[PDB]
Amino acid sequence: NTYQEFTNIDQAKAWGNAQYKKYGLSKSEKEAIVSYTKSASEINGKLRQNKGVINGFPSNLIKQVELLDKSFNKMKTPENIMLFRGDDPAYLGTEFQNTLLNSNGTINKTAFEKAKAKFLNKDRLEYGYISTSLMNVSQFAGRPIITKFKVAKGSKAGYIDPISAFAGALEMLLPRHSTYHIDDMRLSSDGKQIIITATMMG
Numbered sequence: 001n002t003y004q005e006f007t008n009i010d011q012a013k014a015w016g017n018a019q020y021k022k023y024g025l026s027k028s029e030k031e032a033i034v035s036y037t038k039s040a041s042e043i044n045g046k047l048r049q050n051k052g053v054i055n056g057f058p059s060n061l062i063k064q065v066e067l068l069d070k071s072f073n074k075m076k077t078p079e080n081i082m083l084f085r086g087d088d089p090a091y092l093g094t095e096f097q098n099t100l101l102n103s104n105g106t107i108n109k110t111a112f113e114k115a116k117a118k119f120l121n122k123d124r125l126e127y128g129y130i131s132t133s134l135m136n137v138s139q140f141a142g143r144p145i146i147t148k149f150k151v152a153k154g155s156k157a158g159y160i161d162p163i164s165a166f167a168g169a170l171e172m173l174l175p176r177h178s179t180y181h182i183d184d185m186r187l188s189s190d191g192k193q194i195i196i197t198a199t200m201m202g
Contacts, residue, residue, distance in 0.1 A: 001080050001152075002080060003080045003081060003082045003150045003151075004079055004080060004081045004082065005081075005082040006082075006134045006135050006170075007135075009135065009170070012134040012135055012170050013161075013170065015134075016134060016159035016161055016162075016170060016172070017159070017161075017162060019077075019078070019158075019159045020158075020159045020160075020161070020162050023071075023074045023075055023158065024074055025071060025074060025075075028067055029067050029068075029070065029071045029074075030163055031067075032063075032064045032067035032068050032071070033068065033071065033160050033163055033164075033173070034163050034164070034165060035064060036064070036068055036129065036160075036173075037160070037163075037164040037165045037166055037171070038165050040128075040129070040131060043061070043064070043065070043128070043129070044127075044128025044129060045128070046061070047065075047127040047128045047129075047176055048127045048128055050127075051127055052127045052176065052177050065176075068129065068173075068176075069175065069176070071158065072156040072158065072175045074158075075156065075157065075158030075159075075173075076154055076155065076156060076157065077151055077152075077153060077154070077155055077157040078153065079153050080150070080151070080152055080153050081134075081151050081157070082148055082149065082150060082151070083132035083133065083134065083148070083149045083151055083157070083172050083174070083200075084132055084133045084134070084135060084136045084137070084140075084146065084147070084148055084149070085130065085131070085132045085133070085140070085146070085147045085149070086139065086140020086141075086142075086143035086145065086146060087143060087144075087145040087146075087147065088143060088144065088145070089101060089144060089145075091145055092115050092118070092119070092145070093118070095114070096111060096114075096115065099111045100112075100115070100144060101144060105192055106191045106192055107144060107187055107191055107192065107193065107194055109187075112185075112187060112194060115185065115194065116185050119182050119185065119196075120182060120184075120185050121181075121182065121183070122181070122182055123179050123180070123181050123201075124179065124180055124181075124182060124198075125177070125178075125179050126176070126177070126178055126179075126180070127176060127177060128176055129173055129174065129175065129176045130149075130173070130174040130175075130176075130178060131169075131171060131173060132149060132171070132172045132173070132174060133169050133170045133171060133172065134159075134170040134172060135170055137168065137169060137170060138168075139168060139169055143193070144192065144193050144194065145193065145194045145196065146188075146193050146194070146195050146196065147196040147197075147198055148195070148196070148197050148198070149174075149180060149198050149199075149200045150183075150197070150198065150199045150200060151174070151200045152200070155200060155202075156174065156175045157172055157173070157174055158172065158173050159171070159172055160172070160173045174200065178200060178201065178202070179201045179202070180198040180199060180200045180201060181198060181199050181201065182196055182197075182198050183197045183198060183199055184196070184197040185197075
């Protein structure tokens with residue numbers, strides 16, 4: 001199908017803002033999301049280390065995770081939409097940490113080949129929540145990997161930007177334990193990034 005790609009920040013904001021006012025999040029839900037934007041790396045890190053099992057977590061965290069999960073009952077995208085994300089080398093694996101990037105800042109083509117072999121046309125499970133943006137915003141111009149997720153109409157997806165502690169990200173959040181299938185991997189025009197196109201599943 002066709003996936004809406006925002007090409008203008010003000011249009012992205014107005015659409016996102018409009019989605020958000022309809023959500024009708026509870027007070028507790030909003031608090032959990034505000035806190036997630038402050039400490040996402042810790043939360044997602046614990047979810048990956050424990051493969052989605054929250055039983056051992058502190059009770060404040062168990063509560064926070066259940067509230068973020070429950071929030072996606074109210075937060076669905078009303079259309080097919082493209083979402084974006086910047087990632088550092090470790091995203092592809094420990095092996096890529098210090099091998100994806102040449103000294104001059106270009107993508108090493110041999111590491112690109114091991115990444116394409118490892119990931120192209122394959123499913124990937126993510127234990128954490130997935131923070132994305134409505135556009136390829138400048139916050140992740142410095143990042144070597146850009147992923148474009150194709151998110152179907154009716155899929156769980158929420159514009160949480162109005163209540164984020166941080167500005168400028170046009171932030172759309174996706175639920176934890178999502179699987180996506182990597183459809184395409186190519187180098188960018190200047191050779192400094194890998195562009196990944198993926199289809200988001202349940």
